[PDB]
């Protein structure tokens, strides 16, 4: 009924009403970095 | 360096790169 990944998290599931398999891919994420000249020069920043 | 490659590496360097290999 359920599949699992190395972390024991759910990898895929079988839909309980219609028996098809759905992959579960966690929603996009990532670190956010701010690129900035010192604030003694400018308050403009770029975001990575 | 070998000018014919997509990355100008030498013959020997290519050999080295071909030997060393969530949510
Ligand atoms: C869910 O409903 C459908 C009809 O739309 C039926 O064919 C199916 O067997 C039902 N699933 C379960 C698990 O009862
Ligand atoms: C930084 O800003 C101060 C004003 O608060 C100014 O006196 C200082 O000379 C500035 N230094 C540089 C390196 O821009």
Q: What is the resolution of this structure in A?
A: 3.2
Cα gap A46→B11, rounded to integer Å: 40
CB A13 within 8 A of CB A2: yes
Per residue in A3-21, is it b (16+ CB within 10 Å) or e — as a string? eeeeeeeeeeeeeeeeeee
Q: Please state how this structure was obtained.
A: cryo-EM
User: Cβ–Cβ of A6/B22 closer than 8 Å?
Assistant: yes
Which residues have CB under 8 Å from A2's CB, separation 6+? A10, A12, A13, A14
Which token pair is A29? 């994420």
Residue nearest (by alpha carbon) to ligand 1 atom 14: A17
Which of B:1-23 have CB within 8 Å of A?
22-23
What Å distances lie between residue B1 and A25, B11, B18, CA to CA? 42, 7, 16
């Amino acid at each position: 009924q359920f599949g699992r990944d190395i972390a024991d998290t759910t990898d895929a599931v079988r839909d309980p009403q219609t028996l098809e398999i759905l992959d579960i891919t966690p929603c996009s994420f990532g670190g956010v970095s701010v690129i900035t000249p010192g604030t003694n020069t400018s308050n403009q920043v770029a975001v990575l | 360096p070998d000018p014919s490659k997509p990355s100008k590496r030498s013959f020997i360097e290519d050999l080295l790169f071909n030997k060393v290999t969530k949510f």
